[PDB]
Amino acid sequence: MKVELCSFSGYKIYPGHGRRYARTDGKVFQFLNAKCESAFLSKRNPRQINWTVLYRRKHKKGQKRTRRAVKFQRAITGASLADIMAKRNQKPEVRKAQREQAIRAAKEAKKAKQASKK
Amino acid sequence: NFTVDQIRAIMDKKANIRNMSVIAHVDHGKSTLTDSLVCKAGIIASARAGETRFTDTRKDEQERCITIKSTAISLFYELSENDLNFIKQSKDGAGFLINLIDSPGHVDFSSEVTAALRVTDGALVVVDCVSGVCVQTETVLRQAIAERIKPVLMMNKMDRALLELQLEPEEL
Amino acid sequence: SGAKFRISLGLPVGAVINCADNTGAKNLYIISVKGIKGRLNRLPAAGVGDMVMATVKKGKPELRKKVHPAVVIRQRKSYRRKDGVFLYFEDNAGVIVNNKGEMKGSAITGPVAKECADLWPRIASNAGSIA
Amino acid sequence: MKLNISFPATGCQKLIEVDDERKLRTFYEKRMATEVAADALGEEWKGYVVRISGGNDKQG
RNA sequence: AACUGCGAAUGGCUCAUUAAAUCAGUUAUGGUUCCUUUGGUCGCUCGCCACUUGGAUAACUGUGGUAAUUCUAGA
RNA sequence: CGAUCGCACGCCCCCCGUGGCGGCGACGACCCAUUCGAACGUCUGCCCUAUCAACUUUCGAUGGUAGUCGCCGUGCCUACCAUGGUGACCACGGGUGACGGGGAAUCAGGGUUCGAUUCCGGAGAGGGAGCCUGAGAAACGGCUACCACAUCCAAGGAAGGCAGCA
RNA sequence: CGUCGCUACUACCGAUUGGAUGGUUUAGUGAGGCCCUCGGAUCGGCCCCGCCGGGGUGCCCUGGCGGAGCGCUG
RNA sequence: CAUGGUAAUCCUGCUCAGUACGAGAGGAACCGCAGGUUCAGACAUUUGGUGUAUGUGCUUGGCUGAGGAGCCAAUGGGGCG
Ligand SMILES: [Mg+2]
Ligand SMILES: [Mg+2]
Ligand SMILES: [Mg+2]
Ligand SMILES: [Mg+2]
Ligand SMILES: [Mg+2]
Ligand SMILES: [Mg+2]
Ligand SMILES: [Mg+2]
Ligand SMILES: [Mg+2]
Ligand SMILES: [Mg+2]
Ligand SMILES: [Mg+2]
Ligand SMILES: [Mg+2]
Ligand SMILES: [Mg+2]
Ligand SMILES: [Mg+2]
Ligand SMILES: [Mg+2]
Ligand SMILES: [Mg+2]
Numbered sequence: 001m002k003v004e005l006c007s008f009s010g011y012k013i014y015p016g017h018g019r020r021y022a023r024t025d026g027k028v029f030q031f032l033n034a035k036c037e038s039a040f041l042s043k044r045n046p047r048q049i050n051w052t053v054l055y056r057r058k059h060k061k062g063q064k065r066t067r068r069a070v071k072f073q074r075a076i077t078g079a080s081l082a083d084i085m086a087k088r089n090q091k092p093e094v095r096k097a098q099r100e101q102a103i104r105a106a107k108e109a110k111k112a113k114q115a116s117k118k
Numbered sequence: 119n120f121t122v123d124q125i126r127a128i129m130d131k132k133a134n135i136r137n138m139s140v141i142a143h144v145d146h147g148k149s150t151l152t153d154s155l156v157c158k159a160g161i162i163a164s165a166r167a168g169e170t171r172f173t174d175t176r177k178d179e180q181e182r183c184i185t186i187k188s189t190a191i192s193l194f195y196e197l198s199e200n201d202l203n204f205i206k207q208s209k210d211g212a213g214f215l216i217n218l219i220d221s222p223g224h225v226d227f228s229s230e231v232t233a234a235l236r237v238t239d240g241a242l243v244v245v246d247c248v249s250g251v252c253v254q255t256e257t258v259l260r261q262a263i264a265e266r267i268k269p270v271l272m273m274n275k276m277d278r279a280l281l282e283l284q285l286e287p288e289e290l
Numbered sequence: 291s292g293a294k295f296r297i298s299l300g301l302p303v304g305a306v307i308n309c310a311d312n313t314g315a316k317n318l319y320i321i322s323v324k325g326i327k328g329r330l331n332r333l334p335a336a337g338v339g340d341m342v343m344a345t346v347k348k349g350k351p352e353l354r355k356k357v358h359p360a361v362v363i364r365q366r367k368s369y370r371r372k373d374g375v376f377l378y379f380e381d382n383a384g385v386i387v388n389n390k391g392e393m394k395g396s397a398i399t400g401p402v403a404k405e406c407a408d409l410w411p412r413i414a415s416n417a418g419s420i421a
Numbered sequence: 422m423k424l425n426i427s428f429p430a431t432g433c434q435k436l437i438e439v440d441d442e443r444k445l446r447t448f449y450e451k452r453m454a455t456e457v458a459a460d461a462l463g464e465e466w467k468g469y470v471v472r473i474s475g476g477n478d479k480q481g
Numbered sequence: 482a483a484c485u486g487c488g489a490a491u492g493g494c495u496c497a498u499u500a501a502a503u504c505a506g507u508u509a510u511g512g513u514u515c516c517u518u519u520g521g522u523c524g525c526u527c528g529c530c531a532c533u534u535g536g537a538u539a540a541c542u543g544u545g546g547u548a549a550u551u552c553u554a555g556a
Numbered sequence: 557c558g559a560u561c562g563c564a565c566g567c568c569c570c571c572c573g574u575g576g577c578g579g580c581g582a583c584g585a586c587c588c589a590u591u592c593g594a595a596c597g598u599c600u601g602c603c604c605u606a607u608c609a610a611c612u613u614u615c616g617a618u619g620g621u622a623g624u625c626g627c628c629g630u631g632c633c634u635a636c637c638a639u640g641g642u643g644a645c646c647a648c649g650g651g652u653g654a655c656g657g658g659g660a661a662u663c664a665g666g667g668u669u670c671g672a673u674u675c676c677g678g679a680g681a682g683g684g685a686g687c688c689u690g691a692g693a694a695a696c697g698g699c700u701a702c703c704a705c706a707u708c709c710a711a712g713g714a715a716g717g718c719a720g721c722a
Numbered sequence: 723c724g725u726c727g728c729u730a731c732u733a734c735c736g737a738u739u740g741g742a743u744g745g746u747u748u749a750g751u752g753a754g755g756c757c758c759u760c761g762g763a764u765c766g767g768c769c770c771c772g773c774c775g776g777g778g779u780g781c782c783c784u785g786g787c788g789g790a791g792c793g794c795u796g
Numbered sequence: 797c798a799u800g801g802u803a804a805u806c807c808u809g810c811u812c813a814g815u816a817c818g819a820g821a822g823g824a825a826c827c828g829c830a831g832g833u834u835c836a837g838a839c840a841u842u843u844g845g846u847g848u849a850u851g852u853g854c855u856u857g858g859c860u861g862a863g864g865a866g867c868c869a870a871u872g873g874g875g876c877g
Contacts, residue, residue: 016842019368019376022421024383024400025753034844035876042875064792066766071430107573114573144820164548168710183814184821225819253819282815293809293831298843312704327807327833351741368843376843396706415711425544427556434556436544454764474555480712481547 006032008040010053119160120194128194128215133208137217139188139234140272141262142244143252144224147274149173149185151244152220161194161215173220185222188230190237193218223254231258232265240268246275247290248283294409299335300367306347307382310363310402311395315349318384321357336362336384337369339406341391344384360384361391361410363402363417377403377421385413427474448473 004013007021007029019037021029031037039049046052056062075081128134142148153171156163163172170180175189193216202209221234235241241262245255262269279285301307303322309315324341326334336342344360346353364383368376383400387393393413401421407414414420422445427434439445439462447461451473459471 015374017374019378019843022377022379022401024364024380026401026419026421028401028421038876065790067790068766073430074432110573145814164710166548166710182821278815282813291810291830296832325808325833329834370843374842411711415709423545425546425555427544429556432543432556434544452763477546477554478712479547481549481552 004030006030006036008032008036008046008052010046119162119164122162125161125192125215128211128213131210131213134210134213135215135217136240137238138240138242139219139221139231139238139267140242140244141221141231141234141255141258142223142274143246143249143254144185144222145183146223146244146246146249146252146255148220148223148244149183151242151272151274152191152218155218156191156193159193159195159216161192163191163193185220185224186228188219188221188228188234190217190219192216223258225254227254227257232261235261235265235267238267240270242272243269244272244274246278247273248275248278294339294405295372297337297405298367298369299337300369301336301362301365301382303333303335305336305382307344307362307364307384309346309349309386310383310399311385311393312397312399313350313353313386313395315346315353315386317347317349318344318360318386319347320344320360324359338362338365338403339409341387342384344386346386358386359389361387361393361406361413363398363406363413364400365403371405379403379421387413426471 003015004018005011006013006018009032011032013030013032018030018032021031021037021040023029029040031040039046047055047058049055073081076084079087140148140152149170152173153166153169156172157165157167166172170183172191173189174180174185176187179186195214195216197212197214199212202212217238219234219238221231222228223231241259243255243259243262245251259269276290279290301320303320305320307318307320309318320336321343323334323336324343328334340362342360342362343357345357362382362384364379364381366378366380366382368378370376379401385393385395385398387410391410391412393410393416396416398413398417401419402413402417404420407417407420422440423436423438425434425436441462444462447459448457451457453473453475455473456470457473459469460466
């Protein structure tokens with residue numbers, strides 16, 4: 001079920017009208033009536049003939065939705081949505097204890113190294 | 119449908135290869151039966167379904183559907199374990215391999231049938247129902263017994279009995 | 291399957307058509323049409339996908355002075371395709387074939403008529419583009 | 422006619438075959454990357470709008 | 482395994498083409514390009530991440546298609 | 557106008573004590589020079605042919621001039637003016653069973669023939685033509701089109717280039 | 723010594739607009755590439771701005787959601 | 797309706813069936829299906845043709861003082877209809 005469009009006049013051709021043109025190069029064309037195909041065989045520019053639709057489109061005689069998707073919910077091997085949530089939300093003054101503990105441990109090791117060398 | 123050099127692994131795996139030669143009277147579906155064989159299966163073979171196939175490796179064979187020169191094909195197949203205990207003889211693995219030679223059984227007695235028999239261990243004798251046992255089938259099994267080839271009967275063309283003759287099952 | 295449909299003939303016996311193949315023959319002078327019963331003073335004509343015969347006029351010399359079977363693949367006389375579309379091409383073109391239908395060249399230049407294509411599978415396989 | 426469905430958010434993408442032409446009308450003659458309503462399939466594809474990531478011709 | 486970097490413009494073969502053309506010697510580019518090697522230069526400018534910023538992406542997992550390719554897609 | 561990567565690791569501590577400072581590299585780079593070169597150029601030099609003596613100049617031929625492009629010099633090409641340039645010192649045209657040279661054969665001397673071929677330069681990768689990347693290709697065991705061959709094909713397409721070793 | 727007589731060879735002329743082979747070109751068509759002007763299937767961000775929100779303190783830090791700024795840039 | 801005229805014809809392809817038959821090579825038929833040739837009888841939706849609707853543009857020469865509007869040139873030509 002195909003409604004063609006005229007290769008010159010740019011018109012919806014209904015099944016009962018028009019003809020086809022097949023070119024030795026391989027190109028195919030469709031014309032509405034004798035007038036259109038005579039113009040085409042005359043090599044006339046349709047954007048010059050005053051009623052070809054593409055002419056009006058050129059001359060402006062007549063007359064988008066980028067919807068975003070920001071998602072991150074996947075779990076990660078060795079953990080899950082719960083586990084990642086739990087280890088992401090120790091914000092209420094729980095990180096600091098681990099923070100200072102690691103810093104002091106690093107400080108204690110460097111004093112241990114100071115002892116070993118001297 | 120595997121690569122070219124894995125024929126080694128099964129082909130040296132003794133007691134697993136099977137060598138057949140199909141023998142029948144003329145036009146008895148040797149080509150058709152072997153094409154049915156090659157379609158589904160294949161060690162590299164595809165699933166061609168257009169009547170004649172790799173059985174006839176020569177012109178003026180497909181243009182008269184008459185077999186002239188015997189052709190060999192390598193084929194593969196994977197077997198389900200139920201058959202792997204079905205197999206009474208020595209069985210080694212699931213990847214069973216076939217060396218099949220489709221050979222013309224014409225009344226000229228193109229010695230290709232004999233060549234295939236010599237290079238094979240088993241024979242797939244194909245005999246039609248409505249045509250009965252043909253003379254050339256008797257000929258080909260006559261050299262099969264002489265050369266000590268294991269024969270196996272593959273009777274064909276019952277669609278003629280069903281639709282053409284509209285025969286009764288007991289008469290079948 | 292199904293046999294072809296009658297089409298506008300528009301290609302009489304006296305016509306001169308070109309070869310769309312690689313056999314090197316250029317011209318084709320229709321000689322008769324295969325399968326035409328005939329009539330009084332009605333010179334038989336060809337259409338796309340008709341087994342006809344023609345002589346080559348311009349082309350390779352060894353190929354000239356002979357009568358060869360041919361099939362017609364192009365024409366500039368229109369004909370309805372039973373669906374209300376009328377199709378015609380620039381020129382009337384055909385390709386030299388053997389008796390059975392195997393076109394004796396190996397390539398076809400330009401498009402082919404779909405009726406000719408499914409009437410002759412060999413040329414359809416070789417046909418550049420279908421139309 | 423094989424339909425490859427995918428949840429990029431959840432994975433679990435699988436393949437299903439279909440034949441309902443009336444079903445296929447709904448996504449026939451559509452552009453790619455087009456949000457189309459596939460709710461026609463069964464009574465349980467409701468509330469599912471889908472995007473056309475592409476497809477593969479009969480000749481692969 | 483993949484991404485990345487380099488090489489793939491070497492070499493091998495043949496002499497069809499080519500008659501001041503190639504080529505031989507000579508001499509110029511102060512009228513030009515030159516990855517690489519090597520030696521130079523790399524704080525010369527005043528002008529809310531720098532204790533390091535963003536995004537994709539193969540390989541990899543899963544779902545396919547094609548008679549068919551060092552064809553590939555979608556997630 | 558380094559948001560890089562290894563291999564040793566170490567040093568100053570007043571303010572301290574956690575920061576501050578240094579080694580060996582590698583990978584880098586705008587550009588300069590050098591190297592490998594490449595390209596176009598100077599002068600001279602080539603077999604036979606006059607039953608090839610006048611060519612070239614519309615369609616660049618010979619220049620000037622301003623330009624385009626090219627990496628640059630240069631009708632490379634364009635726009636305007638000049639009618640020019642070569643030729644019996646063989647121009648031009650035709651053949652060449654012509655890739656050139658180093659050299660090979662012959663050897664009183666003189667010369668005569670042969671150099672497709674391992675070295676050098678040039679060209680080609682079936683015949684044309686156009687390209688991408690790349691410093692370097694008009695590349696072809698790179699791509700694209702045509703022609704000519706030519707493989708498989710469920711006929712819907714896909715893939716070719718042994719003047720490389722065999 | 724010639725003509726004439728016999729036989730083979732060899733070229734030469736020859737209607738056939740002989741035919742073929744390449745190259746050079748004239749006019750015409752012209753695939754393909756590159757360049758140019760466009761063109762915009764898609765893919766981004768700013769504008770988020772209805773907000774739940776709120777903080778230096780309804781004058782938001784914003785935690786994410788949601789329309790969409792129906793613009794502004796790639 | 798007495799009467800008189802009278803019209804249909806042939807060939808393909810599929811299937812039958814690669815079957816009957818035949819050693820093989822070869823190789824039909826009937827039912828059915830899809831067409832096609834010749835002839836006949838109509839008809840213009842479509843496609844083409846015709847075109848002086850002298851319908852509408854374009855245009856040669858001349859003519860109405862020019863613009864507009866037109867006309868003549870035995871259908872002025874020509875494009876479309
Ligand atoms: Mg007569
Ligand atoms: Mg040579
Ligand atoms: Mg790093
Ligand atoms: Mg030589
Ligand atoms: Mg050399
Ligand atoms: Mg490079
Ligand atoms: Mg090259
Ligand atoms: Mg090249
Ligand atoms: Mg009567
Ligand atoms: Mg008129
Ligand atoms: Mg006038
Ligand atoms: Mg007036
Ligand atoms: Mg007037
Ligand atoms: Mg008058
Ligand atoms: Mg008309």
